[PDB]
Ligand binder design. Structure first.
Ligand SMILES: [Zn+2]
Ligand SMILES: [Zn+2]
Length: 96
C-alpha cells in the first residue's frame, strides 16, 4: 500500500546555462528548426540531444602541413606526405 500528493510551480531555466554553447545551438533550432555540427559543419540534427551523440565521436582534431599546406584526416598519412615530398635530407647547404 501507499499514498501521497503534491503540487507546486516550476519557474526554472532549462538544462542550458546563462552563457553556454547549448543555448547557442538551441537557438539555431528555435529559429530555423535544426542545428549543424560545430566540428564538421556538414550535417546537423533536429535538436541538440541528437547532435551531442554525434559530436561525442565526430569531435576529432584536424591537421594542416606547413611546407605546402596539405590537409589530411589521418595524421600518419600526412606526416608521411612531408617526408616523401618535402624530403630534405641533412647533408649540406647545397645539392651539387
Ligand atoms: Zn560532426
Ligand atoms: Zn606538405
Amino acid at each position: 500500500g501507499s499514498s501521497g500528493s503534491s503540487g507546486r510551480i516550476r519557474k526554472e531555466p532549462p538544462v542550458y546555462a546563462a552563457g553556454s554553447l547549448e543555448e547557442q545551438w538551441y537557438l539555431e533550432i528555435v529559429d530555423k528548426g535544426s542545428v549543424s555540427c560545430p566540428t564538421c559543419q556538414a550535417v546537423g540534427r533536429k535538436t541538440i540531444e541528437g547532435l551531442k551523440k554525434h559530436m561525442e565521436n565526430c569531435k576529432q582534431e584536424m591537421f594542416t602541413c606547413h611546407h605546402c599546406g596539405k590537409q589530411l584526416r589521418s595524421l600518419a598519412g600526412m606526416k608521411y606526405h612531408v617526408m616523401a615530398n618535402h624530403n630534405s635530407l641533412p647533408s649540406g647547404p647545397s645539392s651539387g
